[PDB]
A paper describes a structure:
In bacteria, however, a different strategy employing a class of enzyme known as polysaccharide lyases (PL) is deployed. This enables PLs to operate through a β-elimination mechanism that relies on proton abstraction from the C5 carbon of the uronic acid sugar ring, resulting in double bond formation between C4 and C5 and elimination of the preceding sugar. The three characterized PL33_1 enzymes were all from Bacteroides species inhabiting the human colon: BT4410 (BtPL33HA) and BcellWH2_04512 (BcPL33HA) are hyaluronidases from Bacteroides thetaiotaomicron VPI-5482 (B. theta) and Bacteroides cellulosilyticus WH2 (B. cell), respectively, while HMPREF1181_01744 (BsPL33Heparosan) is a heparosanase from Bacteroides stercoris CC31F (B. stercoris). The enzymes are 68% identical and contain a larger N-terminal α-helical (α/α)6 toroid domain (residues 21 to 401; BtPL33HA numbering used throughout this section unless specified) and a smaller β-sheet C-terminal domain (residues 402 to 635).
Crystal structures of BtPL33HA and BcPL33HA reveal a two-domain structure. The C-terminal domain possesses an extended loop region between β-strands 5 and 6 (Leu455-Leu484: BtPL33HA, and Ile464-Leu493: BcPL33HA), forming an octahedral Zn2+ coordination site [supported by anomalous X-ray diffraction data], along with the loop region between α-helices 12 and 13 from the N-terminal domain. The two domains oppose each other in such a way that a deep, open-ended cleft is formed resembling an active site that would be compatible with an endo-processive mode of action of BtPL33HA and BcPL33HA. Analysis using the Consurf server, which maps residue conservation from a sequence alignment to the structure, demonstrated a high level of amino acid conservation within the cleft, consistent with it housing the active site residues. Analysis of the five enzymes via SEC-coupled light scattering and SAXS indicated that the three PL33_1 enzymes BtPL33HA, BcPL33HA, and BsPL33Heparosan are dimeric, while the PL33_2 enzymes ObPL33CS and ObPL33Gellan are monomeric. SAXS data indicate that the dimeric enzymes all bind as head-to-head homodimers, generating elongated envelopes. This is consistent with PISA analysis of the crystal structures of BtPL33HA and BcPL33HA which predicted a buried surface area of ~1,388 Å2 and 1,006 Å2, and a complex significance score of 0.207 and 0.290, respectively. The phenol of Y470 moves within 5 to 6 Å of the +1 GlcA and N-acetyl of the −1 GlcNAc, while F475 moves within 5 Å of the +2 GlcNAc, forming the tunnel topography.
Numbering used by the authors: 26 to 642
Write the structure that this text describes.
Amino acid sequence: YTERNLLQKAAGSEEQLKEALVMNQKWVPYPAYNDRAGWNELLGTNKESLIRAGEKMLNYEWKVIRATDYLEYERSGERNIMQNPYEANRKAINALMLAELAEGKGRFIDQLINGAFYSCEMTSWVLSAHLVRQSTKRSLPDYREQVIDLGSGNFGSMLSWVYYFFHDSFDKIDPVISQRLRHTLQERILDPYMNNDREWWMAFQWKPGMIINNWNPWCNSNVLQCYLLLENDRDRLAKAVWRSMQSVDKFINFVKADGACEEGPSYWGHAAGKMYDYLQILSDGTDGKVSLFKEPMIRRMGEYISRTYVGNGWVVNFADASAKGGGDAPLIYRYGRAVGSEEMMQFAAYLLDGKRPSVPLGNDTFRSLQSILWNGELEKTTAAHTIPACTWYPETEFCYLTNKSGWFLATKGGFNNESHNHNDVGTFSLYVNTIPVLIDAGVGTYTRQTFSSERYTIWTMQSNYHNLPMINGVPQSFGQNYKATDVVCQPKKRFFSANIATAYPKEAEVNSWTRAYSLGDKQLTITDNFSLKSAKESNQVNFLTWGKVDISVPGKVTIDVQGQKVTLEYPGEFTATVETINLPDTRLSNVWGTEIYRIALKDKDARLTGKYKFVIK
Ligand SMILES: [Zn+2]
C-alpha cells in the first residue's frame, strides 16, 4: 500500500471536479438513437448480426428467479441454480438494446419494456452468493435493504443505458415504465452507493492485511456510468463522482507499481481492465480533464497481458490459473489506444489471428458499445506480438525471458500467500516454439478442500509438483513469511536468482539455497547452490512435463512434445524416475490431455553443501 492518490491529485478537489464535469450527457460518444445514419456508419457489417441477435429475443421468455433459487446458496452453496436464469434474462435485454440501436424501427421496444418492467419487479439485482452481505447475512433478497455487487453493478449500468436511449420511446407507450425504472435505479445503485460507507469493495474501512481487488474498480466503473447517465444535479453528481475517485484511488494505491497483475492473466480483464474502463468513463465524463493515461504505471498494468502471452493460446500460469488464455482483443485494443501502447494494439490485432473482431453480447453494455465504437480501428490495425529478451517485474517478482530460437522462460520469486496462491517460490516454466515443455499444472475444479486449510493436500498447490527442489525431502510451506530473499535479475545476462531457503520451514534444516536461471541463445542453465544445517535426507529435484519422456540414457532426460524436443542433463549423483499423473479432473485434462509426468531426480547421497547444475538444450 502506497499513498499515491492519483485521481484526487489530477482533479485537485471536488469543486474543481465539478467545473470539469460534462452535464446533460453530452459526453456520450455514441450516435443518438434517432441518428440512423450515424449508427449505420458506425456499425458497418456488424449491423446485421446485432439485428439477428435481437430477433432471437423477440420470443424470449422472462424467467422468475425463485426464492428457493436464492435459498439454495445457504443450503448447499450452489449458485448456478440462481445465476443461469439471471444471466439469460440480463443478456436478453442487452442483446435487445444492441439490436434496437442497429435497426431503429422500434421492433424490439416491446421486449425492452418487458425486460425493464420485469427488472423493476425483481426484488434484487444481486447474486445469491453476494446477498449474504445484507444486515441479516441471508442469501434471500430482503426487500427492505439494498446491496451493490458485481452482478447488480452490471445490471444497473445496462438498465441505465436502456433508460438513456429508450425512455422517450417508452414514454410514448406509457410514462410509468421510464418513471419507475429511473426510480428503481435511484433506489438500487445511486442511493446505496452514497449512503453506505461500509461496502467492503469500496475500501473506506481498509487497513493493512485486508484485500482490495477487481471488485473495487469493477463496481466503481458501473456506479460511475449510472451517475453520468442519470444524475442531472451538478452538486449531487460531483459529490458522487468524487467519492468514486477516492474509492478507486484506494485500488490504485494498493497495486504494485511494476504493473503486474497478481491475480494473473485470467483476471487481468476485470482488474486492470475494469480500472481502465473506470478511467475511460471518467475521462469522457470530464472532457479529458481528469486523466491518468499518461502515467507509466497505468501503461504497464495494461502491457502485462501482452508479456504473459507465450503463443497459440498458452499463457504463463503461476498460482491457481489456467495455462490457456488469449483475452478480450477489443478491450486490449481500447486500453492500448488510451495509453499510447502500440504493443497493446498490435497484440489485440494478433489475438484475432486473421479474423474480424466481434461486438460482444454478454452482460457488459459499456463493453458492447465501446466495441461498436472502436472495433473498426482494431480491424485495420497491423498485428504483431514481439516479445523482448527480458521482462522484469521487481515488486511482484515475475521475470519473463526469451531467446531467438523461440524459447520462453518464466520464473518467480514472491511469497506463499499470493492471490490464488500456489507454493512455488523460485519455480520456472519453459516453453519452446510456444509449446510448453516444463510446465506448471494450474487450476483444477473447486472442491470443499480448495479454500479450506486442507488446501495444500491438493497436488497442484504443492511445491512437490512444481519445478523446484524438496530440500532434505521437505517441500515449501504456506504462509506470507515463506518468501524468496536475495532476489536478483540481470536483464543483460538473462539471469534470475532467488534464495528460496526462506520459503521452506525449519524442518528443511537449510541455511541457504539459491536457485538460479540463465537463458542462453540455445540453452537454459539451472543451478541449485545450497548449505544445509544437517544432511538428513537426499534432496529431490522435480520437473513437471508431458508428451513422451525418455530416461533410458543416464545423465539425460529427453522430452518430446508435439514435435518439439528438449534434453535435460543432470549430474551423475542423481537417479531419475518418471511418475505418471493421471488427470480425472477435466478442467486439467482439457488443457493437458489424460496424463502428465513428474521427473523425480533423487540425489544418491545426502550432503551438507553442494551445487547442482542442470542444462536444457
Ligand atoms: Zn502452479
